[model samples]
Target: DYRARLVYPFSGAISPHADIVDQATLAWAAMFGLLTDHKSRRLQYGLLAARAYPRADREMLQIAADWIAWLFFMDDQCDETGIGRDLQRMIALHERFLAILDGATPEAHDCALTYALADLRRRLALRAPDNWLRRFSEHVRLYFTANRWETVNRQRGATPNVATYCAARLFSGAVYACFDLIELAEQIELPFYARHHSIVQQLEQAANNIICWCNDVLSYPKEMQHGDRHNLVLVIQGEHQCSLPEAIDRALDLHAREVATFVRKRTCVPYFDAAVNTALEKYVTGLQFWICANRDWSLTATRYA
Candidate 1:
């Protein structure tokens, strides 16, 4: 069901801190547009930024060092098995994030995403911090089950409860567009797809894009309810889920499987339930939800990009 080859390279080379790093980085970038106004988000964003840096990046080094020192020396629990391992990984990724930041402008930085990413990196690298685990679990519920969507919308005065299938279709289009952008930006020549790095970028961007698109398309009714921004993934009727002329589907499928496999194999235990019955129940329910709820019924919609 998944494309193993495309995912294998990333997974093979992935460090223990990869997920958290990705989470923190993404959170910072995604929330940059919203940081100034929301208090909870603002503080969370700051914390995310604080946890993302190593003591090396000059811009963030001081804060990072301070936090690291505080956690390691001040908190006895910092030395605990899972928490300790996670802290070490955070230190490593914080350094890496700083290295990347050294050359980047502040305007271009995504402190919140980086912090959230570091948050995930910590959990993935070691044991789950209670608060972090709760947040992460809640996020999954939002994505996998799409629960918080309507709540956010309703708070804003819009309808929430858009069909799951529509959500999936919207995601499919968006995911396709992300791939298209990668193909275009990376200059992958037509009639050949294997040689360019574009495919790799496409896989990565598409993974995130699918999730983001789901939020975007499904978020509108809530917004309409609350008078927030209205964004609907435009549908080119009868064109959703369009397959490529050649091996594109194969490539995408390969990449999807790889991502799914890599993430599924990673343990976020001590927080997430490990009961086979619970796991199976979640899987079966989500599968059913996606099957019926996914919106992209058309196999040939406009490319997501």
Candidate 2:
């Protein structure tokens, strides 16, 4: 256990060591998923991942290789700060990298993760001062603390009706936003579906965001519960939803549709974007699996009708 590696922090109030252990636990779960399920997906994703206009550029290629390794291991614990440092270091070590690539690459060429990380390194390095990564970390860190859960709470807190359902949608929204940014930013040309792309792209992004918020309320029951007011999914579901199974199925269906928009030429096909598409499949499968395992909802009735 990583926690065992610590000393006084085991009993202390404020402990970086404890945080490390928390991260370790989270990391292990994420890594296990990669090794088990995501391994096959990675191969499919890798083929899609390798097609970059910068294929000839050895520096960019090496960065792609390094990034795949890092991503498979990083998981959710990899906050913006950690990734920024990695991006910065890659650029600093490979200044020749930026020199080789020029025009905007096509989506069929390479994965968005490659495009985004490479571009981010170049841009951030240019704009930032000496400690570029550390200095810019704050801008990225502002996302998580933004009270997304609270947004759901406020929407459903009083109604006790659609609250938890709203919370589930929020969870889905978070996934959509975070991944969309990561994948879209990689493009040199800037996709129309991305905020960096066009106004329509921004609007599309917003709609996806709102849809997930709605689905959150739809998924409140099984995912969350009452008095566990902090459990946004539950607070909404327990108070509002009629059936847990029905809620999940509906939310999953909603999520599937929302994800479909991104899988288009812009979001997925563009940066050779594999991660978001792969994750979309994962999200769907996860929901389906939940339905199959659940005892509450009647899948047969929902299925036939």
Candidate 3:
């Protein structure tokens, strides 16, 4: 058994948006026919996300909560069922989602997931920047791609090497999609140059790595119960022929280094224009909130408990 206490600097406290999260989660849960436990999961996940979007208005918070519920419910559905194993069907479903995001109305037989995504798409178009909308769509597509990769690997009894797994984990973790909302929540559009700068991109990766590794650690026990190998601790154990404790240590080490990298990158972010610099600072602060808030919520989430 693995026993490791993860640690990180706390940049903030639990969000004060519990009421909004709870209400949004309940409405979406009923609409989607989600299980009882999801009310808790969605509330926790939405609370965590609220940290990154603390200044968001009521409508924005509710919209974000709904999207979080959709993501968690779909993730569990794919992971727990044989749906993930059928690549052809998964692809068809993914295509349908893309069409919905592209403004196609769902038909009578479309699933709740499709309807949820369509609602999110409509809300996003109303408030989110066009560029942010496009980026969100791209991240969602990449997430689907990474999920398919994991399903294929699992079907083949393939344990991905750390390098390959990290690449897929970056997208599958959904950090980028979440990050896309930083600008929206703040009601600011970062310029293309600032958004795509090398330092900013690296910083984004650092946040992704930190959150993903932290997730691997907290979810290790639950994943073990499910006999799943898509976790870093399991991957490290298989790759290095190490004990669970040792694998946990490796995962913690990686998270710490990613945290250090994030701090360094935050300092080294080059200046563009005055307005861009201001926007970058806020965006980076949003990432910091993600790191701390994710850590706090993971510790208590029933999904992990």
**Model 3 stretches astray by more than 4 angstroms:** 1-5, 36-43
Clashing pairs in 3: none
TM-score, one value per model: 0.22, 0.31, 0.94
Candidate 2's C-alpha runs over 4 A off are 1-145, 148-177, 180-240, 260-305
Instruction: Write one digit per residue (lDDT tens) for candidate 2, span 187-283.
Output: 2222234323343343345344433433243334422432223333344345556465554444444444543443342333223266544543333
Ranking by TM-score: 3, 2, 1
Q: Which number leads on TM-score?
A: 3
Task: Pick the lDDT winner.
Answer: 3
Q: In angstroms, how far off is 156's CA in candidate 1?
A: 31
**Model 3, CA-based lDDT:** 0.80
